[PDB]
Amino acid sequence: HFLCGVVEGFYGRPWVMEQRKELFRRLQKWELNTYLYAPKDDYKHRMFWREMYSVEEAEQLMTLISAAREYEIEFIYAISPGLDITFSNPKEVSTLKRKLDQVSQFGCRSFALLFDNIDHNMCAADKEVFSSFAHAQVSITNEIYQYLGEPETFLFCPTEYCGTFCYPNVSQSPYLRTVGEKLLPGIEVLWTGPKVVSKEIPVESIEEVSKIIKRAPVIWDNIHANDYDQKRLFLGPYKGRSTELIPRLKGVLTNPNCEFEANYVAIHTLATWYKYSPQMALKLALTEWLQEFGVPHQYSVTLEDLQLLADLFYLPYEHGPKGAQMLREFQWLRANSSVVIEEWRSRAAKFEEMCGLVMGMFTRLSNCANRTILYDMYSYVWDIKSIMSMVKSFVQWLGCRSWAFRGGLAGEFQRLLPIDGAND
Amino acid sequence: HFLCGVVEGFYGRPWVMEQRKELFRRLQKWELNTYLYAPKDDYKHRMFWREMYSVEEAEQLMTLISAAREYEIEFIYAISPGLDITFSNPKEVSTLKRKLDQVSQFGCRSFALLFDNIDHNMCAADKEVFSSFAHAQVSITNEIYQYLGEPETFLFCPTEYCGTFCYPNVSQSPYLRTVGEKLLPGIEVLWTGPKVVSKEIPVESIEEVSKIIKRAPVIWDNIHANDYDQKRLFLGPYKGRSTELIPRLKGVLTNPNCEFEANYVAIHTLATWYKSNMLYSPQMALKLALTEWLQEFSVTLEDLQLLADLFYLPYEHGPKGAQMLREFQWLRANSSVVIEEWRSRAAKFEEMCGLVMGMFTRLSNCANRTILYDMYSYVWDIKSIMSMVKSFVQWLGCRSHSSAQFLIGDQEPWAFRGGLAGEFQRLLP
Amino acid sequence: WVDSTPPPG
Amino acid sequence: WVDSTPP
Ligand SMILES: *[C@@H]1O[C@H](CO)[C@@H](O)[C@H](O)[C@H]1NC(C)=O
Ligand SMILES: *[C@@H]1O[C@H](CO)[C@@H](O)[C@H](O)[C@H]1NC(C)=O
Numbered sequence: 060h061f062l063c064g065v066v067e068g069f070y071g072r073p074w075v076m077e078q079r080k081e082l083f084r085r086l087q088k089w090e091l092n093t094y095l096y097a098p099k100d101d102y103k104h105r106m107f108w109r110e111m112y113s114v115e116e117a118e119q120l121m122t123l124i125s126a127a128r129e130y131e132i133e134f135i136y137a138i139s140p141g142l143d144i145t146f147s148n149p150k151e152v153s154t155l156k157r158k159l160d161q162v163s164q165f166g167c168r169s170f171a172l173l174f175d176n177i178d179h180n181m182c183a184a185d186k187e188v189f190s191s192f193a194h195a196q197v198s199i200t201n202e203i204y205q206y207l208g209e210p211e212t213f214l215f216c217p218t219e220y221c222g223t224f225c226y227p228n229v230s231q232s233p234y235l236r237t238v239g240e241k242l243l244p245g246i247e248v249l250w251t252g253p254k255v256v257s258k259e260i261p262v263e264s265i266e267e268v269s270k271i272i273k274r275a276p277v278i279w280d281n282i283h284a285n286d287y288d289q290k291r292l293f294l295g296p297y298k299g300r301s302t303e304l305i306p307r308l309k310g311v312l313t314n315p316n317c318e319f320e321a322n323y324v325a326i327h328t329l330a331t332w333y334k335y336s337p338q339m340a341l342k343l344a345l346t347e348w349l350q351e352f353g354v355p356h357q358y359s360v361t362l363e364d365l366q367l368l369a370d371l372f373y374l375p376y377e378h379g380p381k382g383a384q385m386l387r388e389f390q391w392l393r394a395n396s397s398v399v400i401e402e403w404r405s406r407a408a409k410f411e412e413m414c415g416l417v418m419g420m421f422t423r424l425s426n427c428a429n430r431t432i433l434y435d436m437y438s439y440v441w442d443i444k445s446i447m448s449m450v451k452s453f454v455q456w457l458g459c460r461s462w463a464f465r466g467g468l469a470g471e472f473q474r475l476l477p478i479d480g481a482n483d
Numbered sequence: 484h485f486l487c488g489v490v491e492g493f494y495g496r497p498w499v500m501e502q503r504k505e506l507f508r509r510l511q512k513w514e515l516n517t518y519l520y521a522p523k524d525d526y527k528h529r530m531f532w533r534e535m536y537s538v539e540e541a542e543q544l545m546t547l548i549s550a551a552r553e554y555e556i557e558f559i560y561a562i563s564p565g566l567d568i569t570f571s572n573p574k575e576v577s578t579l580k581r582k583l584d585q586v587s588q589f590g591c592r593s594f595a596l597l598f599d600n601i602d603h604n605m606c607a608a609d610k611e612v613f614s615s616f617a618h619a620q621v622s623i624t625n626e627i628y629q630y631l632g633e634p635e636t637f638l639f640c641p642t643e644y645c646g647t648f649c650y651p652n653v654s655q656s657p658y659l660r661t662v663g664e665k666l667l668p669g670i671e672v673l674w675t676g677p678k679v680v681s682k683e684i685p686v687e688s689i690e691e692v693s694k695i696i697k698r699a700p701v702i703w704d705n706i707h708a709n710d711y712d713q714k715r716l717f718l719g720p721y722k723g724r725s726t727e728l729i730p731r732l733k734g735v736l737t738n739p740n741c742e743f744e745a746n747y748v749a750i751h752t753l754a755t756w757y758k759s760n761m762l763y764s765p766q767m768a769l770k771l772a773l774t775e776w777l778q779e780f781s782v783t784l785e786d787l788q789l790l791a792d793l794f795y796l797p798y799e800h801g802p803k804g805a806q807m808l809r810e811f812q813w814l815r816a817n818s819s820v821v822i823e824e825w826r827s828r829a830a831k832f833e834e835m836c837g838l839v840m841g842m843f844t845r846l847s848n849c850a851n852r853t854i855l856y857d858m859y860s861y862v863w864d865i866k867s868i869m870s871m872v873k874s875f876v877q878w879l880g881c882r883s884h885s886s887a888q889f890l891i892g893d894q895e896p897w898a899f900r901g902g903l904a905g906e907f908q909r910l911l912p
Numbered sequence: 913w914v915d916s917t918p919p920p921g
Numbered sequence: 922w923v924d925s926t927p928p
């Protein structure tokens with residue numbers, strides 16, 4: 060069965076129980092079917108992977124896993140032991156068995172071992188027992204998989220998990236050769252595409268990686284991930300992945316924005332893709348998203364607002380049409396300001412009205428009854444409304460006859476990189 | 484009685500009930516005495532201020548008000564009706580009385596009307612009735628104050644709440660003049676100083692405002708507020724307010740960072756300043772705060788000092804932060820010499836960067852997950868940027884043997900920071 | 913002149 | 922490793 064759904068796979072504050080149960084409802088509603096639990100900074104997933112859940116945590120995980128079953132979402136429990144595990148120490152193995160057994164007792168039936176974002180260099184004792192980093196990973200992964208009863212879903216995330224991490228390249232990687240040869244056939248391999256955040260995942264690159272791992276991979280897709288840049292958020296449509304990938308893949312799990320409610324579009328358009336025009340799927344997602352934004356019921360937000368908001372916070376490699384238009388208009392006004400024709404005045408006035416629509420979108424979103432939606436997006440919307448307000452004032456200034464610490468220390472250092480804005 | 488404590492008065496995600504209870508515990512423990520409830524985006528405080536608390540909300544608030552009384556903190560309940568109230572309409576005045584009576588039934592005995600950050604004009608109806616905005620505001624405020632039996636603590640936040648918002652200036656404004664003359668003497672007035680975020684609040688600025696409002700103000704201090712800039716966080720000491728203001732003020736209420744756990748230093752140092760003069764050293768108050776905060780968190784004191792210096796004050800970097808910037812500015816201005824001075828200054832700068840990275844990874848591994856999550860995005864952001872600056876200093880040192888560009892070929896998106904927002908920002912001078 | 917944000921000085 | 926970039 061093709062796995063399609065969400066990995067909670069990012070750095071930062073993980074989602075809480077209520078957000079996760081809401082996720083499972085949305086996944087079921089849109090006919091997705093999988094959740095992979097892998098939050099980088101949920102303590103006992105990674106930094107303290109050895110440590111067993113407390114009684115209170117066990118209760119919560121069990122309730123979470125029961126909610127997944129109740130909504131017909133497959134729950135996959137991941138663990139990330141690669142930072143400090145001695146693979147040849149049988150006590151390390153037993154610890155990993157016992158942690159997973161504990162999660163089995165919570166009702167979990169599917170699992171993953173993740174080895175992303177760790178060093179290629181094994182300790183002395185492991186170098187004794189294993190001929191390569193990949194033999195070490197593969198034999199612990201095979202042993203765990205057999206120990207758990209060959210669960211129908213078991214995932215493996217390679218250290219070489221995209222094209223640019225593959226040494227010396229994908230088709231000739233000794234690491235991936237061993238994975239392809241030794242990893243038992245019932246274990247799926249995760250892959251992010253040509254890069255960590257893939258702009259495109261071409262059919263040919265999937266044909267390439269599949270040949271070496273000797274199976275069709277499950278995509279861990281970071282297209283909507285935003286943990287890597289405080290100022291970014293991605294509300295544009297799933298894009299750059301052809302539907303002709305589907306018969307070439309074992310699944311697609313999207314690792315989306317850290318802010319839970321910001322992920323309506325990312326997950327709705329993946330569902331559309333699964334069930335393709337990105338602009339058509341964007342329009343369907345925003346039309347349905349609108350229904351979440353009503354004002355509260357009192358006893359004493361438009362579609363065009365959402366289109367502008369998505370265009371201002373679109374995709375890691377493209378801005379939405381309205382965002383690109385405003386930026387080109389501002390560039391021009393600025394480049395032609397020494398002039399102050401009726402042209403510059405006409406266009407400055409039209410641009411000021413565009414800035415006004417940004418500020419109106421913020422004001423109406425602040426009237427929204429679903430307060431978690433406003434709070435999840437708040438700092439992005441406040442930021443773009445503050446900048447636009449400053450930009451509109453600056454355009455006024457350039458036309459009148461007649462913030463020094465913005466972004467703090469980080470902002471200062473960044474402005475000192477002579478490369479700053481290279482990609483603008 | 485001097486009011487000293489915290490106002491939850493920022494824009495964005497409000498604190499939740501257990502954070503608020505913990506805050507009272509902190510305020511008590513450090514001998515502060517006051518909490519003003521005013522979160523801009525708690526929808527029944529402002530956006531829908533006419534609305535009564537529901538049964539479930541009323542239980543939560545009643546519980547919260549009991550917790551304050553249990554920790555000996557005075558709970559001031561604020562409301563912000565100015566976006567859309569018709570000041571002269573009978574039904575508006577009673578809706579406001581009705582809202583405030585409900586809260587009084589929860590146990591609350593102190594109240595505030597806030598008129599900050601609204602349009603300075605009136606609808607046609609209020610224009611028939613009142614001669615000015617100030618008259619409309621003061622009339623509704625006096626009437627509410629009387630209606631509630633003249634509570635021991637009642638606050639008014641003016642529309643002209645700092646120097647910058649006075650028209651045409653502080654000493655001659657007709658708005659503040661009306662406030663000073665007509666606002667009943669038992670009503671206190673909130674003031675943020677010369678600016679919204681005041682670098683300093685000079686005694687003569689406060690005398691000057693005092694003569695016009697005809698009373699000592701309560702300071703609404705925005706020194707540690709961080710709702711107005713996504714990337715900024717303030718962990719430096721309370722500073723720029725002489726202890727000689729204490730005799731000249733009715734109180735100081737600090738509006739601190741949105742992220743609850745980030746306010747250990749903000750509130751602890753305010754408490755030190757207060758207790759010093761019920762003089763004060765900012766650097767010694769900061770030392771005491773960070774020492775005590777360390778016990779909540781492996782993370783070292785020196786980790787906390789560097790973290791505070793990186794995320795210090797609105798108009799000032801701390802020592803270790805200002806020093807890294809100076810070196811980087813030097814390394815970059817003298818990179819053409821690539822001589823023994825540059826190389827050894829480079830290797831030190833790279834080691835300083837390593838201390839940022841070590842501070843990040845030790846925080847990431849600490850046991851107090853609650854503090855980590857509140858700080859996470861600030862700490863990730865500074866570690867990522869310092870890692871790029873470090874690799875840039877390396878690249879400049881490598882120019883004696885390489886003519887390659889700093890970025891070679893296709894990049895992950897985080898090589899170019901800020902998205903569309905950052906592109907607009909870079910087009911501003 | 914709302915949202916705690918005056919125009920630039 | 923502190924993010925998805927080789928040190
Ligand atoms: C690498 O980077 C993504 C985006 O920053 C992060 O969320 C993810 O946890 C990391 N691992 C993988 C397999 O992407
Ligand atoms: C404007 O300034 C602060 C800082 O942005 C904001 O938190 C507060 O709500 C506003 N009002 C006052 C009185 O500071």
